[PDB]
């Protein structure tokens, strides 16, 4: 018999993104080639099957630095990290291949699905 | 020119609640009278003006235990913590006064607004 506040989840994610932009309570650095991205482990886990597996591991859960596979493109990662914190995906002709490959590696099934649909259309 | 995934914020919050139920990556205990509640500092901050102020404080940001004012009712807190992680508020005749008082203390303005509306109706 609960009541529900429709905008609550969106408002929570918006505030988590504000904490990320101000570097507040970030507890991990994701290294992609030369590039470094600060984030919250919980948000990464909530969005990615790969980070979920990494941070539930009794040894890796305690790491402050995570290095991604050298094939991962920093721009593709940046676009996906922005999507994690906003629900908005900056999908363009020039980045779609790098975004799909990064989403497959990160295990972000809904992003993989839209990339496959957008590629098929063209 | 981004695209948006409508269910992303809800799915993120659902996964954060799953991490909470399994006690994964929880980094704070909230003490309310004899009762203890484990949570994620980021989620508490995203939902509450009080926790936002506490965890942006250079000294308090590092505490693993936070004790609430002794006037705070553990059930009112439990109902509000559930709302933070689900968007669902278990508002009932027998708990509405304790929920409103706890929401005013936690600075959760949208919960305070619905409690004031439900009280006015009766």
């Amino acid at each position: 018999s609960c009541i529900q506040f429709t905008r609550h989840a969106s408002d929570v994610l918006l505030n988590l993104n504000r904490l990320r932009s101000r570097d507040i309570l970030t507890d991990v650095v994701i290294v992609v080639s030369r590039e470094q991205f600060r984030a919250h482990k919980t948000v990464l886990m909530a969005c990615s099957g790969l980070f979920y597996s990494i941070f539930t591991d009794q040894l890796k859960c305690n790491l402050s630095v995570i290095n991604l596979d050298p094939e991962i493109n920093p721009e593709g990662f940046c676009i996906l990290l922005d999507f994690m914190y906003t629900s908005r995906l900056n999908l363009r002709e020039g980045n779609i291949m790098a975004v799909m490959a990064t989403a497959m590696y990160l295990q972000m099934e809904h992003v993989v699905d839209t990339c496959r649909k957008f590629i098929k259309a063209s | 020119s981004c695209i948006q995934f409508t269910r992303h914020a809800s799915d993120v919050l659902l996964n954060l609640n799953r991490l909470r139920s399994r006690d994964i990556l929880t980094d704070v205990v909230i003490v309310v009278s004899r009762e203890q509640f484990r949570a994620h500092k980021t989620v508490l901050m995203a939902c509450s003006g009080l926790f936002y102020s506490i965890f942006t404080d250079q000294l308090k940001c590092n505490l693993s235990v936070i004790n609430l004012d002794p006037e705070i009712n553990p059930e009112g807190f439990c109902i509000l913590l559930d709302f933070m992680y689900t968007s669902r508020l278990n508002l009932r005749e027998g708990n509405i006064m304790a929920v409103m008082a706890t929401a005013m203390y936690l600075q959760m303005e949208h919960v305070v607004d619905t409690c004031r509306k439900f009280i006015k109706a009766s």
């Binding site: 609960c2 009541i3 529900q4 506040f5 429709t6 | 669902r88 508020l89 619905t114």
Partner: peptide, 4 residues
């Protein structure tokens, strides 16, 4: 607020 809604009835979910």
């Amino acid at each position: 607020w809604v009835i979910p």
